[PDB]
């Protein structure tokens, strides 16, 4: 049966994995992450996305063990396509969250298997919906719905920063200002800057977008001179 300390210890590996933050908006959802340093000689042209698609309308990111993450993304991908194949409509974001919660709880319920050292953010829209969805799953198989959340290294200082800049009654007013808040959130922690931030933006009905190194620079050289203007003030 293992012991419950294994779940607390799994979650300590999740704390040593790099930072990830997601936010709802008025008409979008975003996921963003502390992409590690690409080491010298590491191949740029295929470098891992850190954020991952499960379909056109569900997207996921993790902290902790990157190996365990592949297996949960791939158990999620096969569930999404097998669900569409068997039930004639795409997976809802909560059903996918319940399947990922199901497998995470399965490895936490069995004594003959270690539980995954992976917490996740899971985000998207339901089919034919414009309420943005956001979730948070844990090594323990527990899950919860969110407006804004952070996992991984230094994630408390990002939760401080979110509680000082976000309101559940009044999100960042449109998809542009989600990026301001989420880039500025990661700039509290990602001391090497615009190389290390990665953001993916989702809109109703299957539009999903990776922001390039150029748009994240445009946001960082917007937030930086707003910081200078506030320093001159």
């Amino acid at each position: 049966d293992g012991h419950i300390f294994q779940v607390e210890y799994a979650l300590e590996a999740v704390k040593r994995g790099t930072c990830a933050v997601g936010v709802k908006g008025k008409n979008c959802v975003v996921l963003g992450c502390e992409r590690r340093s690409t080491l010298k000689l590491q191949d740029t042209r295929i470098t891992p996305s850190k954020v991952s698609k499960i379909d056109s309308h569900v997207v996921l990111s993790f902290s902790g063990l990157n190996a365990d993450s592949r297996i949960l993304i791939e158990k999620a991908r096969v569930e999404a396509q097998s669900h569409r194949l068997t039930l004639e409509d795409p997976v809802t974001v909560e059903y996918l969250t319940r399947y990922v919660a199901g497998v995470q709880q399965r490895y936490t319920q069995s004594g003959g298997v270690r539980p995954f050292g992976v917490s996740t953010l899971i985000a998207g829209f339901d089919p034919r919906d414009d309420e943005p969805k956001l979730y948070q799953t844990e090594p323990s198989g527990i899950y919860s719905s969110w407006s804004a959340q952070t996992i991984g290294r230094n994630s408390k200082t990002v939760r401080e920063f979110l509680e000082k800049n976000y309101d559940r009654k009044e999100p960042p007013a449109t998809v542009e200002e989600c990026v301001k808040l989420t880039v500025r959130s990661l700039l509290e922690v990602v001391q090497t800057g615009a190389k290390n931030i990665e953001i993916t933006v989702v809109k109703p009905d299957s539009d999903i977008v990776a922001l390039s190194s150029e748009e994240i620079n445009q946001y960082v050289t917007q937030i930086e001179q707003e910081k200078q203007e506030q320093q001159e003030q």
Partner: protein, 182 residues
Amino acid sequence: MDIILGIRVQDSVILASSKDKTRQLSPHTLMSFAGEAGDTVQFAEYIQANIQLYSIREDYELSPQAVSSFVRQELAKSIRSRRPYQVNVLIGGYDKKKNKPELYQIDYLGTKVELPYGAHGYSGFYTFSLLDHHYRPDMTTEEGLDLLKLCVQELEKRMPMDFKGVIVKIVDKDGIRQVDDF
């Protein structure tokens, strides 16, 4: 009847079928089919589900050849046991490494061919004599639609049944385009 017709020109494939009954396996690939009303729909969707799972899992288009060989494999693999049922599949695509339109036919036994133009449906016997005189490797897309309109008119001249309304679709570098004779 439920005829399927496929015609390959210099830089497009045109897929046509009697009045559904096609799948966009990828935004650069199609599969217009015909056969027994049950098992062909489950097969078309099972093919779309794995090809779309690969498409998601790699973020990479599987080639028209590779999906054609996948479709022949799953058809052979489901002809074992059970008993052969009447089905026909045309896979029409564009290959973005070779820069070519491509058209494969696969009959119910798993016999995979690649030919200028292909049909399934017994009135197809009318079309082959019409498409041997005009077919040309140099054709542009609108010469394709002109070949098709001849075929559909002679199919209509020889079919007083409900043959009204082909659905017609074009595949090239710009992806699937649904298009009209009208």
